[PDB]
Amino acid sequence: TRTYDREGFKKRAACLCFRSEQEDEVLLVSSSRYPDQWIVPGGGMEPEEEPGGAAVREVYEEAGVKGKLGRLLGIFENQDRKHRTYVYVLTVTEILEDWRKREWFKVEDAIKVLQCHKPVHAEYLEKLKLG
DSSP: OOOBOTTSOEEEEEEEEESSTTOOEEEEEEOSSOTTOOBOOEEEOOTTOOHHHHHHHHHHHHHOEEEEEEEEEEEEEETTTTEEEEEEEEEEEEEOSOOOEEEEEEHHHHHHHHHHHOHHHHHHHHHHHHO
């Protein structure tokens, strides 16, 4: 089920999954329906979920990884779709074998990939450089 805030935005969560604490390489994935499109893993929050819980669940489901949840990068508001997405960072500790594709990308290459594939997700990684 979907959940909304009092301003009518759909609540979502997403996560930049990093290979290490360096935050140099991020895991991108592609979905089942659009396998040639790289995206950052994320999705809708469920009704009684906290944003970090959603984030952790989404990376397990859409990326097949587990790790240590880090800071809230920010809340990204997509006015074209009326989304508000809590984007976290996470340090990957386990890659679940037998889990669609998933690849490590240096952040700069990830931004270039996403600028074509999914511009909104590119903004997530740009926020790392922004500060």
